[PDB]
Amino acid sequence: MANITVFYNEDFQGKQVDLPPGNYTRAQLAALGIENNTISSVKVPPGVKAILYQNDGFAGDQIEVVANAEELGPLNNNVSSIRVISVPVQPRARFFYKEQFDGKEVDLPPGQYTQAELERYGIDNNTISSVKPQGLAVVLFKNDNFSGDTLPVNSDAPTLGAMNNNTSSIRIS
Ligand SMILES: [Ca+2]
Ligand SMILES: [Ca+2]
């Protein structure tokens, strides 16, 4: 019942398409219609972990995700091959764009992120705000390699766009 959902245009914009898990490429896609510069944004719920592949035929710099990716990454200039495999259930956290549990919503599973993936994997170098732990507590860092001042969000906070200065790294515990 799971299935990844891509977006034609960037910024989580542009008609989306639901593709079933499993491994496939330009061949299967040829059957559909989309291919190449199209898988701009992505949205993949838990229960499964996806792996993207720039060049078709499963080649080129690959990627790995299990949540949504408003801004995939630099290699987003070309996409066609992918690989998805079911995965155990894992809680996560939910962040909102505007300060008011609103605006572009993004979420990430438990783990660690830096000033590169995090931003280009859920939001960006900043503009976070209101957070809502969907299952695990969230901790923010104000420096690369998660090393410096921090703000451990041990609970609900539908408003935080006034403290986290430049979120360089995070740790969903
Ligand atoms: Ca963009
Ligand atoms: Ca806020």
UniProtKB/Swiss-Prot annotation:
Q: Which residues form the Beta/gamma crystallin 'Greek key' domain?
A: 2-46, 48-86, 91-135, 136-173
Spell out the Pfam families in the cross-references.
Answer: Crystall
InterPro entries per record: Beta/gamma_crystallin (IPR001064), G_crystallin-like (IPR011024)
Describe the effect of S129R. Answer: Lower calcium affinity
**Record-level Gene Ontology MF annotations:** metal ion binding
Q: Does the keyword Metal-binding apply?
A: yes
Looking at the keywords, is Manganese present? no
Positions that bind Ca(2+) 2: N37, Q54, N78, S80
Q: Name one GO biological process term.
A: sporulation resulting in formation of a cellular spore
Domain of life according to the entry:
Bacteria
> Looking at the record, which segments are called Connecting peptide?
87-90
For the ligand (Ca(2+) 1), the binding residues are Y8, T38, S40, N77
What keywords appear on the UniProt entry?
Calcium, Metal-binding, Repeat, Sporulation
The UniProt similarity line reads:
Belongs to the beta/gamma-crystallin family.
This protein's domain notes: Has a two-domain beta-structure, folded into four very similar Greek key motifs. The N-terminal domain (NPS) binds 2 calcium ions.
Q: What function is annotated for this protein? A: Protein S, induced in large amounts during fruiting body formation, assembles on the surface of myxospores in the presence of calcium ions.
Q: What is the name attached to this protein's record?
A: Development-specific protein S
